[PDB]
Symmetry: C2
Subunit: 284 residues, 2 copies
């Protein structure tokens, strides 16, 4: 077993890039075909062997929690496989926990809110608008799953990265020139936010998945809170590696990424994929 | 002016065909690209000249009302165009009203709940999971708009219909043989639910838009759950009830495929993202 027993999911942000759809609903509940973003992400954690999930949330996001809880009126209304399917959304051995975020305070702070739940233990941190494509990787072996096994072997933190066209647009890691392929981990030495062309130490951009040793918690005391800055302070104390994304991710935190993903999952849907796929080809 | 001053929108149903996405959100708030279903439908009413909208709703659907109300924290957050754009979602001259439905009781009952708001006046009834395509019609004078002006001319009820992608799947009107083109209205004599092939009096299926004279209200105090069509039948006995041919196209976003199809079709027409999406599409298949 891993000492990484819980995953933090900061879901407290209002989704201003996905307006007006998110005016009165959480960006985490936008459907990707017929399931909300947050359900794929909780499934990914489950597949990586994490059974305990800590949402850091906002007052207007109750619906995220209702989605995994028992929906009483709905169940009563059902009198098929449908009942069973919605009764399976959260497996009984999986537990969702919730703590509210204080002010509109950034990601490092979001994670800081989850400390009293976790304690001084390593921790998985998961950005809920990035979706790791379950058809192009095996999430029970690759990506988060792999980063946890790597963390258990070495005790080094793991920051997921993927190559990007434009290095000035994301946060970008410094691996001292390192050779890096899908599925590999190698030491990183720094992180810069939206670097200028000449400042970028690489094109490997942070994807939004972190496995952090219990060391970050004391470091999360000091201000920049942004996570990366606190990560930097750990790189000074201890070895922090970067892990190359396997398969594909979809950034569903921008409109186009979300419309792209909807279609891609739309084609793979396992009762409606073929009709949709056909319809598409004829209509395009 | 029309005496049809208000539109009824039954939004109290739990959306069991769109599960699990609708487990904890209203089927009316599923986004079509970047706006929820209900926002297109309210806009359609607005364009037809209706400034007063009556939602018949359920306890778990507050978010529908929040979507058109002021969202206070969000606005404070903003601080450009975005603020203005979300401040425009409901025009100041438009008013949303809400009443809760009693039991899980059907469509005819939903409309009954809206009677104390409206009174003995004609009424527009609008099914919120059918979306009338705004690019293929002009909604300010086709479809609902046209049915209202027709209703003012003649005082005949108007039941929107379109030739179908079946026939056994829908409710189908009897127009005594008549040919009927997009935009026309003609008398109908009956309605049958999911007829067998050999039973169908036509292939013109009810779309989910109704302009009803104040006559339905007394008739709605009688049973077939409680269903609208049956009550409409009782009016056809008493008075002239016409069928109006849909102009342009509709999307049935009450089934998964119809919704995935619509998402793509509106995806390609989106104002700022249509071309990137369209290109991305063509390259990706």
């Amino acid at each position: 077993n891993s000492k990484v027993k819980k995953a933090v999911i900061p879901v407290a942000g209002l989704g201003t890039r996905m307006l007006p759809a998110t005016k009165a609903i959480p960006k985490e509940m936008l459907p990707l075909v017929d399931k909300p973003l947050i359900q794929y992400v909780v499934n990914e954690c489950i597949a990586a062997g994490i059974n305990e999930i800590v949402l850091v949330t906002h007052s207007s996001k109750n619906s995220i929690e209702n989605h995994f809880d028992t929906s009483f009126e709905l169940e009563a209304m059902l009198e098929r496989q449908l009942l069973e399917e919605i009764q399976s959304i959260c497996p009984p051995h999986v537990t969702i926990m919730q703590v509210r975020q204080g002010l509109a305070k950034g990601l490092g702070h979001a994670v800081m809110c989850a400390w009293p739940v976790i304690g001084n233990e390593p921790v998985a941190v998961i950005l809920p608008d990035v979706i790791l494509d379950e058809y192009e990787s095996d999430l029970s072996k690759d990506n988060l799953a792999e980063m946890i096994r790597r963390f258990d072997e070495t005790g080094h933190s793991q920051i997921m990265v993927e190559p990007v066209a434009d290095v000035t647009a994301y946060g970008v890691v410094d691996c001292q020139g390192a050779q890096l392929n899908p599925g590999d981990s190698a030491p990183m030495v720094g992180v810069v936010e939206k670097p200028k062309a000449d400042q970028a130490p690489s094109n490997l951009a942070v994807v939004g998945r972190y496995v952090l040793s219990a060391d970050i918690w004391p470091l999360l005391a000091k201000t920049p809170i942004q996570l990366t800055d606190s990560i930097a302070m750990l790189m000074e104390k201890e070895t922090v590696e970067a892990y190359h994304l396997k398969g594909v991710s979809h950034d569903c935190g921008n409109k186009l990424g979300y419309m792209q993903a909807f279609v891609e999952y739309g084609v793979r849907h396992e009762t409606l994929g073929s009709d949709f796929k056909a319809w598409l080809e004829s209509a395009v």
